[PDB]
């Protein structure tokens, strides 16, 4: 019975953390319909191009194509647009065998460990 | 952070693959591998250079082609997400849970290889444990903080002995003189290549004694991939060190079948063309077994403890093989099972001669269990070794040509094997075991008992076997 | 033996029912505690994900 | 589709260039004849094909064509009463196609695509099907071959073709995804077929012998291993397991051993009769042959084909018995391809992953409940052939850690023509503690204690025989000689079985229990009569000792009327004793 | 200095490039954390570096900064009552800085830079100093730690700081040139310290254990080697030598062994009392501790730091013991690092320079007269751990050549708890002819004849062992049976010694001389009494055997008052016997 109540409590906590994950998923899904989207695209694209030493090309959205246009015609970087990459940018570095993706859902998936470790003690402490 | 993919795998064979143009991968880093079907395998980086990099792959190597299968980076050093609400859960070899419950919320991220413990910041393993087994209580005493494995064969019941120790090990607080609380044991159960029958026995034993609310299991079945066996004991002992030294539990670690771990590292060390030690096992197997075993014991000023019981399957049931030999060089003591006593019908089949607890002298004696204990142990060993080496003399001159006291040793031997070793599933405390040892020592007169002092032999001698039970 | 068998059945059922009820109460209580406390943390994760 | 050419040929190794994007462990048609090989060691733009056929006469530049699918068996109706080779093509269709010799690279379909099978559906249109769920049934021989959804297919049934008769490639259930479900399906042999839950084995695998079910039993989901040098049985015991068992179907996979055994099984099975449903014995055996003169890289695949077929008949509700014959020859095949691939050996040439491959083979046996709800089991008996006797081998000590029953054969005990040559002092079982309630409800009530008395008599005689070889039969006291005589009656009545006699080839649990009661009644009532003043040289020459000794030659129907009269004779031939 | 970048990381091995101008066996700061490494195999413009911590999280491109010096110890006041790791970092300071886990990249000084010392000088301004000459004097735990001119330092003293309290950094002697001489100096670990002359050894190293000091002795300038299997008695013997021997200082080198058996030495040595003084036992020991889970490349450094610290205390006039356990772990560490060098090995896998390393290690002992004129000694007791239990290994049969005083531990005497498990048949000592006049002067005059008679009785026992194991303990005559029973009483009452009883852990050789004199008096008078004719097994039932048996338990204070009574009881019991 003690194992039953402990599994009940942890399985109740899991769906709460999952729906908070869904809320931040919709928060950064309905985010490009907002004028701070070119600013955040320029910021994360410059972070991807600087964390990749000497890139060659960049892959983005067509709608996200002009918003880094000032960074397009400097650094000597090729540009390309794809609709599959709905979020974030991609940087192909100097040969085609090294690639840096900077999607928003990707950043959520990378940082969600320490994010959840702070979220649980934030909303349960 | 940001996704860092590496295309350009040059070579894939066995457990290894090579990725070129890979400089931001660190040594010891963790990579994951995505093929064209979305299946994400894991792997660890084990050689880095400006030309290429070498990855050991933690799963099967089916469907990995070279035109695809990007290699991405995660956890620049290999870590494990550890928590305190981890004590009713099951995990696979990498640490992903297989119980239906959601993954845990990590309270820390500890490095999975584990740093070595400072010899100044240790503490003597001191406190007597009792395991209800008369051999491991009177003759080869386990104490809290010790690393003692069970050296066994192939048909021998080492798993039943480990489960019996796990279900009846209790410290004795009243004989020790530290008061009383009866703090029970958390159990960390790492298992590497348990088939289905051993796993069924262990989980039925744990759920029958009510221990799966105190235990955490890192399971690795026989058909699971044979490279995650390298990470299984290290992430078991990461959780054990966490629970003992940052929450002050009393963790007992059952490390099943270390011979499968050693053959897994033989596989990954023969994939890399490395010069071996003895019988094909690589030269650094001493260092790997040391970095696993030596992560146990007690520290100073802190309430915790990591006690270790590994289990070894000796291949040709000999002490000479590199796996049990190097194991016995790192660890402190062994409990060695004998096939010679198992065919006679004796459980637990422990012959006391090759088995030895090293630091028994820190947990026995006056004011800890009882003042006669070490001398009783020495006299039991002397008299039973006389019985064992007089059986050969009986075998080469026949039965009737014996002096008296030689038949008395020959009767001490089988009375020992049929009454002191041979018990059932019964839990016998240290007083029943000491009075059965004294009742067997009463079969020999004074003057042969030249290792027990005179006050002990004056106040304990003189009880037969018809008074220790009926 | 019949007496202790029926006593085992009655006591085990009467204790397991209270365990089920305490489990349901604990799950509903932790959900209602977590729901009103929410939307503080979504700003935290949305601030730390974004550059 | 990837089509490259050959770069290098060395034995069965074909290093092929131009293979870029070729997945590992695929099946590729190497050579312009259509040779079957499997891709390992990707290196740059270059594969490494182990071919599963002969490899002579290939030139450099011939096309290798990768198919992009792993090694997969066809699983459906048309398999029982079947002989296959190591890549599942039937040998009888080959000899009716080619000749009496096994030529190189002939393509046939593993199932018969002109056999007309009677369909009877069990899924009405509109239902939802998961993996492993039964769609319908086919009457095969005397069995009921239920066909089932592949384990990676989930959907809703759009249409069902009605209850007629069809070919195995006729799409009988079209799901509402476009997916047609046929009567057969292909499955990769290195992937274990999934289950719902693995149970615990609690019902013995009745081998029909007397030393391999009484003293050392294997349960229904158990694993067993038979070592032993040459001339020590090891083939008649495997064929006795294949003949006289309680298993529903038998997959007899023989890799690396001689072909006279294969033609012996093919000749003398259709004349016999299994004692379960009647009809021929061959209508439940699927036998896979890879003879030692046949190619050597294919006996690796033979084992996986055999255990996948056993798992297929396990996933329907049966109780399969797989006899895997000379897995040491499979270890030699792995040694061959490992040394051809330039790998480091470990302990006499075998690759370091040998124990891992061997554990992944023996782990597939088990007592499970399938995905269709029904329960099934598959047991594995692996004959291992260590070279010089010498049980310290890598293959033997690697298979010894995982199996649950170890049946050691001797060479000193098969030179007295004491068959079966199982060493009763050195073999062991681990299913004895689990099969005790089945014994107490299905053979006797005091059956485990009678067995333990037999075992301790054998242990006592074994300990006593060395001082007999010291001093002779003189200085034995009086009971020291009666232990020897009862032990010899045991090892010449109970622990000895002909398998060529008509009636002493099968032995149910009742007949072995009756012989055990006769032996222990003789010992119990003669040791109590040896202390009322009877010579040991009188107790042996009774006419009832022959009635014990020939008790293993009576039928299963004559035996209870023989047993109660023999108990009357044993109880009455000691009352007149003086 | 010599800047390079990391090119390749594989295990505890870093290839750097751009290091052109670096020398062999230097020290490198590898990485941004500043890990300590050592250059072996420089080629082209690269350098292979073995790192003395673990590399995990390093990556290519990180800089390597060379130093230009080999590995050097700091030698000065402040090493007694101290524990260091393999590169001489004091571990108590590391526990103060870090927590309970030993981290990498931490930097501490070996000697305390904050502790004051009580300098009193011996040189005056206007003196001539050569290397090894004393300068002053500092107290250290009662020890008179005298401060030496470093070797290869010659000059004339300009000024000397007056007597007072000073730190170790303060230049206490400024020479006529610009040279200043602090209280410490660094010294490499592969250049053995210079010396004036090497004496021949004529004074035993008193262990305290009876067998290792009577039958197989060690001179004060001699080496000794104790091999044996696991569980035989190596580490308990070496802690007994660390606990009871007559060394002025003791250097204990844990080279790749347990941490619990260094925690034992840290905890229970301050509770004890050093003989020859009154201060505690921890105040005379230095403790180098490179345990098993510490990084493997530091074990060579750990085995050299101990021998150069022992040479430093030799150069002050002390008599140093060096207990180095597990030189085979240093051999295994060399094997693991030679695997990264992709070299070709000798037998068993070890690199071929192993016995040159062992000869250069064991040759650094041996009773010298130092550069300062006064005499000192280092005596090295080395534990060898044979891998298979067999003493037929490239380490064991190399130390077996280059050592005297070999002490072989068998497992058969350790299965039965007969400690110490010294195999008498496989042990020797080459010093029994050099310690003879010291025995005749400082033990008794008839001591070595008594020792040789003990040795020939053990030889006669080991000669009769063939016959008594073939035929039996009976069918001997009475003299041979008396020899076998006297051999039993020697092995149980003189050789056996448990190292946990209060009395009988230490044994002066007056006491061992008394025990041997009693056993020989018993043997010769029983032999004379059995030639004229008395029964055997009434001499085995005499009550003086209790006196000879308990003779090793009585204290050394009342040992003459026990010895005279026991000897008179021997003659009286044999006189009243007839
Ligand atoms: N000389 C001795 N006196 C008393 N007990 C001993 C002695 N030598 C060994 N023992 C017992 O056996 C154990 C042997 O340990 P140790 O010698 O360290 O093994 P190894 O030498 O293989 O490292 C000790 O812990 C102790 O219990
Ligand atoms: N086929 C292989 N691929 C990659 N590495 C290998 C292969 N065969 C051997 N090795 C490893 O390469 C290492 C060679 O060491 P080396 O390159 O000289 O210096 P470092 O160890 O610093 O890289 C050996 O440790 C060996 O284990
Ligand atoms: Mg040791």
Question: What's the short story on this structure?
Answer:
The structure is cut from a larger assembly and holds one copy of chain A (125 residues), one copy of chain B (470 residues), one copy of chain C (51 residues) and two copies of chain D (578 residues). With 470 residues, chain B is α/β, with parallel strands linked by helices.
Characterization of the model:
Chains D, E: Belongs to the ATPase alpha/beta chains family. The structure is cut from a larger assembly and holds one copy of chain A (about 120 residues), one copy of chain B (about 475 residues), one copy of chain C (about 50 residues) and two copies of chain D (about 575 residues). Chain B is α/β, with parallel strands linked by helices. Chain B contains 13 helices and 21 strands. In chain B, helix 2 runs parallel beside helix 4 (about 195-210), helix 10 (about 375-395) packs across helix 12 and helix 11 (about 405-420) packs antiparallel against helix 12 (about 430-440). Chain B is elongated, with a radius of gyration of 25 Å. With about 575 residues, chain D is α+β, with helices and mostly antiparallel strands. The chains are: A alpha+beta (about 120), B alpha/beta (about 475), C mainly alpha (about 50), D alpha+beta (about 575). Chains in contact: A-B, A-C, B-D, B-E. At the B-E interface, strand 5, strand 11, helix 7, helix 8 and helix 10 of B face strand 1, helix 1, helix 4 and helix 6 of E. Strand 2 of chain B pairs antiparallel with strand 5 of chain D. The complex binds adenosine-5'-diphosphate (ADP) (2 copies) and magnesium ion. Magnesium ion (MG) binds near residues 234, 235, 257 and 325 of chain E. One adenosine-5'-diphosphate sits at the interface of chains E and B.
Largest chain-chain contact?
A: B-E, 74 and 68 residues
Radius of gyration of chain C: 22 Å
Along the chain, the helix and strand elements of chain A come as: HHEHEEEH
**Major β-sheet strand ordering of chain A:** 2-1-3-4
Net shape of chain A: elongated
Portion in beta strands of chain C: under 5%
| SS-based class of chain A | alpha+beta
Number of helices, where a helix is a run of at least 4 consecutive DSSP H or I residues of chain C = 2
CATH class of chain A: Alpha Beta
Instruction: Look at the helices and sheets of chain C and give the structural class.
Output: mainly alpha
CATH superfamily placement of chain A: ATP synthase, E subunit, C-terminal
What is the CATH topology classification name of chain A?
hypothetical protein PF0899 fold
Number of strands of chain A: 4
């Amino acid at each position: 019975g003690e194992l039953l109540v402990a599994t009940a409590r942890t399985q109740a906590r899991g769906e709460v953390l999952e729906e908070v994950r869904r809320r931040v998923r919709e928060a950064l899904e309905a985010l490009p319909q907002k004028p701070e989207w070119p600013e955040v695209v320029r910021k994360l694209a410059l972070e991807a191009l600087e964390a990749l030493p000497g890139a060659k090309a960049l892959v983005a959205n067509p709608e996200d194509l002009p918003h880094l246009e000032a960074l397009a015609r400097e650094r000597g970087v090729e540009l390309q647009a794809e609709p599959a990459l709905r979020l974030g940018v991609r940087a192909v570095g100097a040969e085609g065998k090294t690639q840096v993706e900077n999607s928003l859902l990707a950043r959520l998936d990378r940082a969600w460990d320490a994010l959840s470790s702070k979220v649980a003690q934030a909303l349960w402490g | 952070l940001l996704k860092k993919e590496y295309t350009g795998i040059t070579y894939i064979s066995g457990p290894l693959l090579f990725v070129e143009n890979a400089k931001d991968l660190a040594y010891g880093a963790i990579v994951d591998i995505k093929d064209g079907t979305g299946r994400v395998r894991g792997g660890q980086v084990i050689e880095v250079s400006e030309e290429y990099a070498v990855i050991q792959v933690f799963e099967e190597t089916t469907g990995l082609d070279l035109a695809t299968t990007s290699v991405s980076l995660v956890e620049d050093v290999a870590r494990l997400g550890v928590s305190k609400e981890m004590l009713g859960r099951r995990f696979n070899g990498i640490g992903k849970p297989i119980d239906g419950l959601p993954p845990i919320t990590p309270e820390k991220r500890l490095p999975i290889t584990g740093l070595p413990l400072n010899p100044v910041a240790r503490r003597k393993p001191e406190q007597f444990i009792q395991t209800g087994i008369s051999t491991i209580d009177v003759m080869n005493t386990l104490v809290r903080g010790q690393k003692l494995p069970i050296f066994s064969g192939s048909g021998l019941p080492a798993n039943e002995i480990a489960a019996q120790i796990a279900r009846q090990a209790t410290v004795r607080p009243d004989l020790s003189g530290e008061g009383e609380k009866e703090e029970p044991f958390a159990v960390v159960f790492a298992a590497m290549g348990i088939t289905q029958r051993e796993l069924s026995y262990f989980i039925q034993e744990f759920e029958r004694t009510g221990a799966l609310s105190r235990s955490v299991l890192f399971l690795n079945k026989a058909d699971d991939p044979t490279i995650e066996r390298i990470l299984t004991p290290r992430m078991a002992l990461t959780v054990a060190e966490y629970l003992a030294f940052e929450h002050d539990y009393h963790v007992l670690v059952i490390l099943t079948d270390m011979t499968n771990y050693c053959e897994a590292l033989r596989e990954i060390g023969a994939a890399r063309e490395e010069i071996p030690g003895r019988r094909g096992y690589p030269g650094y197997m001493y260092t790997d077994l040391a970095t696993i075993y030596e992560r146990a014991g007690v520290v100073e000023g802190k309430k915790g403890s990591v006690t270790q019981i590994p289990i070894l399957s000796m291949p040709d049931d000999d002490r000479t093989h590199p796996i049990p030999d190097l194991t016995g060089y790192i660890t402190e003591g062994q409990i060695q099972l004998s096939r010679e006593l198992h065919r006679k019908g004796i459980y637990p089949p422990i012959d006391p001669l090759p088995s030895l607890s090293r630091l028994m002298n820190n947990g026995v004696g006056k004011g800890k269990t009882r003042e006669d204990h070490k001398q009783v142990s020495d006299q039991l060993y002397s008299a039973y070794a006389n019985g064992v080496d007089i059986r050969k003399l009986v075998a080469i001159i026949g039965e009737d040509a014996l002096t008296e006291n030689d038949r008395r040793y020959l009767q001490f031997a089988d009375a020992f094997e049929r009454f002191f070793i041979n018990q059932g599933q019964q839990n016998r405390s240290i007083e029943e075991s000491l009075q059965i040892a004294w009742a067997l020592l009463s079969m020999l007169p004074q003057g042969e008992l030249k290792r027990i002092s005179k006050d002990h032999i004056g106040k304990y001698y003189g009880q037969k076997l018809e008074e220790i039970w009926g | 033996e019949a007496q202790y068998r029926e006593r085992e059945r009655a006591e085990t059922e009467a204790l397991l029912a209270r365990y089920r009820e305490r489990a349901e109460a604990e799950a509903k209580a932790v959900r209602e505690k977590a729901m009103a406390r929410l939307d503080e943390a979504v700003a935290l994760v949305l601030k730390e994900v974004l550059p | 589709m990837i089509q490259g050419v050959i770069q290098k040929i060395a034995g069965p190794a074909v290093i092929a260039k131009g293979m870029l994007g070729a997945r590992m462990y695929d099946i590729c048609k190497v050579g312009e004849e259509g040779l079957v090989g499997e891709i390992i060691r990707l290196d740059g733009d270059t594969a490494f094909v182990q071919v599963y056929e002969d490899t002579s006469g290939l030139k450099v530049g011939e096309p290798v064509v990768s198919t992009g699918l792993p090694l997969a068996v066809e699983l459906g109706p048309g398999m029982l009463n079947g002989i296959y080779d190591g890549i599942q093509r039937p040998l009888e269709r080959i000899r009716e196609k080619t000749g009496i010799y096994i030529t190189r690279g002939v393509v046939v379909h593993a199932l018969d695509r002109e056999k007309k099978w009677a369909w009877t559906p069990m899924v009405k249109p509109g239902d939802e099907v998961r993996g492993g769920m039964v769609l319908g049934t086919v009457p095969e021989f005397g069995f009921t071959h239920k066909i089932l959804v592949p384990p990676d297919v989930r959907g809703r049934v759009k249409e069902v073709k009605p209850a007629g008769e069809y070919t195995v490639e006729e799409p009988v259930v079209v799901l509402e995804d476009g997916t047609e479900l046929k009567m057969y399906h292909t499955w990769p042999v290195r992937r274990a077929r999934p289950v719902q839950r693995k149970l615990d084995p609690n019902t013995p695998f009745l081998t029909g012998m007397r030393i391999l079910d009484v003293l050392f039993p294997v349960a229904m989901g158990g694993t067993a291993a038979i070592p032993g040098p040459f001339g020590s049985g090891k083939t008649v015991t495997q064929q006795s397991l294949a003949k006289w068992s309680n298993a529903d179907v038998v997959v007899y996979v023989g890799c690396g051993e001689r072909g006279n055994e294969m033609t012996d099984v093919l000749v003398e099975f259709p004349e016999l009769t299994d004692p379960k449903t009647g009809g021929p014995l061959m209508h439940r055996t699927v036998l896979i042959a890879n003879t030692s003169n046949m190619p050597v890289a294919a006996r690796e695949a033979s084992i996986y084909v055999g255990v996948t077929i056993a798992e297929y008949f396990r996933d329907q509700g049966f109780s399969v018995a797989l006899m895997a014959d000379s897995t040491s020859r499979w270890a030699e095949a792995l040694r061959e391809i490992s040394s051809r691939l330039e790998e480091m050996p470990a302990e006499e040439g075998y690759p370091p992953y040998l124990a891992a491959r061997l554990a992944a083979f023996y782990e597939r046996a088990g007592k499970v409940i399938t995905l269709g709800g029904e329960e099934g089991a598959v047991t594995i008996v692996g004959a291992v052939s260590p070279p010089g006797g010498d049980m310290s081998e890598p293959v033997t000590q690697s298979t010894l850690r995982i199996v649950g029953a170890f049946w050691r054969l001797d060479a000193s005990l098969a030179f007295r023509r004491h068959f079966p040559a199982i060493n009763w002092n050195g073999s062991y079982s681990l299913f004895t503690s689990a099969l005790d309630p089945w014994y107490r409800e299905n053979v006797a009530e005091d059956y485990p204690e009678l067995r333990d008395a037999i075992s301790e008599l054998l242990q006592r005689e074994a300990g006593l025989q060395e001082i007999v070889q010291l001093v002779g039969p003189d200085a034995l006291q009086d009971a020291e000689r009666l232990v020897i005589e009862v032990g010899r009656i045991i090892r010449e009545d109970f622990l000895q079985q002909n398998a060529y006699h008509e009636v002493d080839a099968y032995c149910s649990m009742k007949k072995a229990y009756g012989i055990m009661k006769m032996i222990l009644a003789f010992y119990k009532e003669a040791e109590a009569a040896i202390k009322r003043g009877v010579s040991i040289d009188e107790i042996l020459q009774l006419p009832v000792l022959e009635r014990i000794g020939r008790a293993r030659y009576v039928s299963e129907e004559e035996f209870p009327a023989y047993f109660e009269e023999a108990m009357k004779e044993i109880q009455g031939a000691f009352k007149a004793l003086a």
